[PDB]
DNA sequence: GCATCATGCAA
DNA sequence: TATTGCATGATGC
């Protein structure tokens, strides 16, 4: 049965409410600077369908989008916030988001579109986005009786579901999670959505031209070295070069020829020069590929400028991810894709790149929340944490810690937070998986607060179903009873570590809201740029570094207080390249 | 065109 | 057989 709704010709005062659902349909993928196809609103008056041209000129329509005391619930309301933006009008007074209050319910559920929230709830009532748009090619907005009647379901729905959602939200204890973090911090992402990043594209033309040179001699190398020409990124034609006519050793095969990656060609790196040129021409390979041609790929041809979308609905552990571009991966480890940062600068003249990080943050949290004296005191006393593990594991004095001991307790610190396996640890130390058992249970002796926490965890998951963070996310763990070995560890893993990479994210999101509060407070021309897990980057006016040398890391530390204490590093410089 | 896999970049 | 992601070139459907 279809569903009432006025067709309206013009904006009426019913249709400006108090509160409404509200639908600002913005149907391509990437929002930034997309058209906005059709318009919905269902209040206490009644359901509403209006064209956008007619009410995003309406004087009145505009001042209630940008009323904050006019409250609108919504799904994904930074997309239609960000399409808003690109056309000068803002949005103001969303109090309910049900994308966000549905991944906060449950991040495995995927939900990514109305239909999939209601369904959470029994309500069936409207078409998945899909449904109507089509996919890929075929995608496309439908005729306006098709689009209209999709569009006011989708408002209908959002009206009916938002107290069912905040009402499990609240027995779930996460009412101010969504209030109070996500729903905030939305804003502040569309802010950084919209504010885009400066890129020297001259300068990314240049390194691509160089790279161009580089994978050529390399390339022609490589030819020399095989005896022939092929496609050296056909990881099957190139296991038929290494493997068969060069005779490799095949310590790893593919689930359809053999494998290739970088830690097999490592081990293989001894027996033939061909290796050591693979792995180079790999390296410059990708950054041309994804970072040179990739990026120039989506930089704004008038302003230079690229606009990630941070998509704030979908890690499983609360953390955010980012699109077209990802800017939460630029290299930076390798000297020479660590240039490719030379290309982020700031958008205004005398501005600089302000780059804020924790120093240890999953660490950090972990001695927390397991309470491990030992871990502690490290942190008390802002110990170099890889090496007061090597000198606990392997019983001796800070002296007596040579690099390598640095290096593999290293590795078991890593093993910790993801979610110890010895298998894991062997695989990553290239030992056996005995002698990384014994690097966990000496781990495990150091540390018996995080051993307690580990095993407690892991019990936790199994009686509840889920494990949480400090501000209340949650992660179902269905897997944790499984009696298939493999299935039940990974749920295992992610018991240990969902709890320490979430809370962080928990700690740098409030950090976010808190620090925008305060550059407003000092009417700093300072604002957030990106985020990459436990950094923060921020372009500024060169003279307020010294106001941010101090505001940023004091407010970053002080976002939660836990047993130990957070510290936070910083550093600014004419590129991106420049802030580290 | 569209999906897959193998690869590699980040925290 | 370590945690969470996203983009690419191949390859084939
Ligand atoms: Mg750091």
Known sequence: AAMAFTLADRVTEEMLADKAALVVEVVEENYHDAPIVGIAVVNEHGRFFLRPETALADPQFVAWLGDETKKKSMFDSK???????????????VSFDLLLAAYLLDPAQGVDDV???????????????????????????????????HLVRKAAAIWELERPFLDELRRNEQDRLLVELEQPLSSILAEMEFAGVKVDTKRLEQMGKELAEQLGTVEQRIYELAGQEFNINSPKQLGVILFEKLQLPVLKKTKTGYSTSADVLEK??????????????????????????????VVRPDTKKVHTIFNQALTQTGRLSSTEPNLQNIPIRLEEGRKIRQAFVPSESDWLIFAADYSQIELRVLA???????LMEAFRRD?????????????????????????????????????????????????????????????????????????????????????????????????????????????????????????????????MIDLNARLKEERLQAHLLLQVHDELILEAPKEEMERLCRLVPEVMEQAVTLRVPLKVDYHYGSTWYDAK
């Open 115 to 149: 239909r999939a929230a209601a369904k959470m709830k029994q309500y069936e009532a409207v078409r998945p986005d899909e449904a109507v748009y089509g996919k890929g090619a075929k995608r496309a907005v439908p005729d306006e009786p098709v689009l209209a009647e």
């Open 268 to 297: 293989l790196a001894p027996y033939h020069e061909i290796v050591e040129n693979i792995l180079h021409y790999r390296q410059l390979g990708k950054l041309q590929s994804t970072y040179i041609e990739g990026l120039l790929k």
């Open 79 to 93: 997309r239609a916030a960000v399409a808003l933006k690109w056309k000068g009008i803002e949005l103001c007074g």
């Open 368 to 374: 927390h929340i397991a309470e491990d004296d030992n």
């Open 383 to 511: 110990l170099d944490i890889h090496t007061k593990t090597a000198m606990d594991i392997f019983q001796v004095s800070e002296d007596e810690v040579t690099p390598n001991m640095r290096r593999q307790a290293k590795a078991v610190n890593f093993g910790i937070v993801y979610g110890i396996s010895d298998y894991g640890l062997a695989q990553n130390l290239n030992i056996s998986r005995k002698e990384a058992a014994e690097f966990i249970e000496r781990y495990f002796e150091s540390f018996p607060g995080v051993k307690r926490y580990m095993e407690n965890i892991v019990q936790e998951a199994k009686q509840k179903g889920y494990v949480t963070t400090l501000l209340h996310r949650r992660r179902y763990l269905p897997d944790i009873t499984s009696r298939n070995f493999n299935v039940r560890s990974f749920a295992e893993r992610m018991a240990m570590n969902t709890p320490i990479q979430g809370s962080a994210a928990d700690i740098i999101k409030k950090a």
